[PDB]
Design a protein around this ligand. Structure first.
Ligand SMILES: *C(=O)([O-])[C][C@]([C])([O])[C]C(=O)S[C][C][N]C(=O)[C][C][N]C(=O)[C]([O])C([C])([C])[C]OP(=O)([O-])OP(=O)([O-])O[C][C]1O[C](N2[C]=NC3=C2N=[C]N=C3[N])[C]([O])[C]1OP(=O)([O-])[O-]
Ligand SMILES: *C(=O)([O-])[C][C@]([C])([O])[C]C(=O)S[C][C][N]C(=O)[C][C][N]C(=O)[C]([O])C([C])([C])[C]OP(=O)([O-])OP(=O)([O-])O[C][C]1O[C](N2[C]=NC3=C2N=[C]N=C3[N])[C]([O])[C]1OP(=O)([O-])[O-]
Lengths: 450, 450
């Protein structure tokens, strides 16, 4: 099975959102804090009609239709998420609804979890399945779905919500460079959900950044070690056209690439010139526990990194910045907007992907995109995904009406025996969206279309 | 990568248990109900010192040691479970504790969930990984871990609890027959956990059996279809030496094999002789919704099946029957006791495995066991696992002291900021068991050894 990777792709996010500027005011934050501080524009959220299942039906239904895939042609379907509706019954069984008709029940895969990382877990699982002795010739399908949703304090501005669907197969326009990757996994308490009854994480936002970069440095090192063996050269930031990142908010996207850049210094690689070596040089004598904790250094990193970041990272940022944290689908929404923006420069280019999940589980990995044939083309994908279309059909909510909706979702999380209030909302959704109709007294869930 | 499957194996279950006969009395059930009705002998349970993490450290630690595996040699580690302690932070990160020292952080995999099925999900994931272009030459390690635990009514007698660890690699004494398998997945509400705050499932025990067999008939059909292509013959119960099953209680183990037998009739295969065709014959005119719902038919099925079941299924039953439902580790505990019992007849034999998970996700799949070389031998495995040893070092609890412990675990499930009460318990565990020391106010968990 040759050149396996992603053949086709679709996305779905709720059209309902709150402008970040409008919110800053609501919260009594300052002029800059969300639009400059977090570097976010607009935050999308599930109201009472939407959840990780419905978002899922949306992105799956939309992919099969638009790339014209026969649902008989699917032989593995996995889901990555961290939003839990049931502790035992996976989202992947809910989705089996759509194959209940095509008569196609012989489909491997369940859900993969660990925090922003499950989607990646699944992706790899599907690639590996296509490449294995048990591959039956049919497609893989991976769904990354999540609703990111936080309690009052300073983490609420970073929610977001979306599903992504990826079809996996041989002869892909987006080809995995199988051996060029680095993971880092560890036992760690930076962000987690111990509180079974609430949607809300316990987040230690200091640790939450120090561990993200701890993991990014180790992934990058492990990827560099592989690259030496493969290609005979030391890896620099110069060796990839684009870096794509898990994007919980744009600020941290910028510090991440700028950290790659700093890693290059430490290794004294190709992309570090003489002027940089001096700028960086005062910081040589710091411990790592110092390199992570140190603001002067972030400051200096970003400045050297500025112009490269504009070349290599900037075009991955459209969707995250206009939607918010999409947890497992974040990376792949960043990758999507990259395809939206530079689908024409892309043939022959190398995309480096960094997946992070708190707790922690992480993997950087590499893709070679290429000249391929529709339906499964860089152009057809960008076209099919209609990211400009979708951004255009959004519906704003005054911060108020959003705070309200938040309090409502909090009452619905975990609960039973409520029909959902339709009016003012149903007609905000595109004809053919799936939506929650009710939850019976046995917590069973019912969806309608349209 | 040749002949990939399971190279080595270990198990762990809590030594603490309640005799099923002793319990029947407690509950005011009748003479037969648990020992004959469910066909269970003895039920193992986690007390306050044990959980799915500690059980996990136990089976992992024990495997690495006893098969003498260097923890640097592990390159993928996945966990299958359905017991949730944290909604986002996977058990697989807790286990990363043990590689925090060997310095080995570059390990793929997270948790797979769907009900009794996650372990199988993981197993396949690891096989597929060894077989993929991204395989780095190191071992797979799969952990199946669960604590099965039910509220008062007639499902409490069917709890159980255990971890299993399986090392995955080429040149295995237990070889996957890659193409000989059948899955069945569906959206269904037979058993699930909607109640985020309780350990207890919502179970619809009628549906729970009708769906199990619905899935078993479809898996078996899909496996038969494959076998025709492969070997040129129609599959009968005669075509495998042993059938191994998810074993939530032995009764349903017997109806499962006997159903395979009935499936053979329907297909009119090799293993159905003339006398059987008549016995079966009144039931020809039933709908499936009749074949599932019909007691006369179970009755007739088991009777034909009796002697074969004693040959092909009976020796897989030791551990399940003396431990109880082990959820994702159940199948593999049944497989383990099969290796314990018939490790000498096993070279050259075919084992057929049926994995089920409610909600529902299911897969039958096949193994060819073989003549191999220690450490990774059928004899060394049976030896290492010491199933007779372990059954001997169990500690009984009067039904009382068990009901008490249950009420205690209910208070601890989901909670924070309690040190665990040691005395009367610590000394019941084998020197070197991991155990919960405390849970702080930030729900973080602390384990000691021994
Ligand atoms: C996964 O596996 O599923 C889990 C995750 C969540 O997916 C894993 C991740 O991706 S981790 C990414 C990091 N964490 C999160 O996304 C967690 C959720 N969010 C938060 O905890 C908060 O939003 C954090 C802590 C990240 C930020 O909020 P604050 O507490 O407000 O931040 P603070 O530390 O005070 O600094 C904020 C930032 O903004 C700047 N700033 C403040 N005021 C400003 C301003 N900029 C411009 N104008 C104004 N008025 C401040 O200087 C700082 O930014 P810098 O860029 O460092 O200068
Ligand atoms: C996974 O994905 O993680 C989820 C699972 C749980 O792993 C998926 C499964 O493996 S499903 C397997 C089936 N379900 C379960 O394990 C769920 C938990 N248990 C239960 O729901 C109950 O224990 C059930 C319903 C299975 C049985 O309990 P009862 O309600 O007591 O059963 P009932 O329907 O009344 O019939 C019981 C059985 O026992 C016989 N019997 C009754 N009294 C007897 C007696 N036999 C002998 N002596 C006495 N006194 C009765 O006739 C029947 O047995 P038969 O063999 O049919 O005759």
């Amino acid at each position: 099975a040759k050149n396996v990777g992603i053949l086709a792709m679709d996305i779905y996010f709720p059209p309902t959102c709150v402008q970040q500027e409008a919110l800053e005011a609501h919260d009594g934050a300052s002029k800059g804090k969300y639009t400059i501080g977090l570097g976010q524009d607009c935050l999308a959220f599930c109201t009472e009609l939407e959840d990780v299942i419905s978002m899922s039906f949306n992105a799956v239904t939309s992919l099969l239709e638009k790339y014209k895939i026969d649902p008989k042609q699917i032989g593995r379907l996995e889901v990555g998420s961290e939003t839990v509706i049931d502790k035992s019954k996976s989202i992947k069984t809910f989705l089996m609804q759509l194959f209940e008709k095509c008569g196609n029940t012989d489909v491997e895969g369940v859900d993969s979890t660990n925090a922003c990382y499950g989607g990646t877990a699944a992706l790899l699982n599907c690639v590996n399945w296509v490449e294995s002795n048990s591959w039956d010739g049919r497609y893989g399908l991976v769904i990354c779905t999540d609703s990111a949703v936080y309690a009052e304090g300073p983490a609420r501005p970073t929610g977001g919500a979306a599903a992504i669907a990826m079809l996996i197969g041989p002869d892909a326009p987006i080809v995995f460079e199988s051996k060029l990757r680095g993971s880092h996994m560890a036992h760690v308490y930076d962000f987690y959900k111990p509180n079974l009854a609430s949607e809300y994480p316990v987040v230690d936002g200091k640790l939450s950044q120090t561990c993200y970069l701890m993991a990014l440095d180790s992934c990058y090192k492990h990827l560099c070690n592989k690259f030496e063996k493969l290609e005979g050269k030391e890896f620099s930031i110069n060796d990839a056209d684009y870096f794509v990142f898990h994007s919980p908010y744009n600020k941290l996207v910028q510090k991440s690439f700028a950290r790659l850049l700093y890693n290059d210094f430490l290794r004294n690689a190709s992309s570090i010139d003489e002027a940089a070596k001096e700028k960086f040089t005062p910081y040589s004598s710091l411990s790592l526990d110092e390199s992570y904790q140190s603001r002067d250094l972030e400051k200096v990193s970003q400045q050297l990194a500025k112009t490269y970041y504009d070349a290599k990272v900037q075009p991955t940022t459209l969707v995250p910045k206009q939607v918010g944290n999409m947890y497992t689908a974040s990376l792949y929404a960043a990758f999507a907007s990259l395809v939206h923006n530079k689908h024409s420069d892309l043939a022959g280019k190398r995309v480096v992907m960094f997946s992070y999940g708190s707790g922690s589980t992480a993997t950087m990995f590499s893709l070679r995109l290429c000249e391929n044939q529709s339906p499964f083309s860089l152009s057809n994908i960008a076209s099919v995904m209609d990211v400009g279309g979708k951004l255009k059909a959004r519906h704003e909510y005054a911060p108020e009406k959003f705070v309200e909706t938040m309090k409502l979702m909090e009452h619905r999380y975990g609960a039973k025996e409520f029909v959902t209030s339709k009016e003012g909302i149903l007609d905000l959704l595109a004809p053919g969206t799936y939506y929650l109709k009710e939850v019976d007294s046995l917590y069973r869930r019912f969806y309608g279309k349209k």
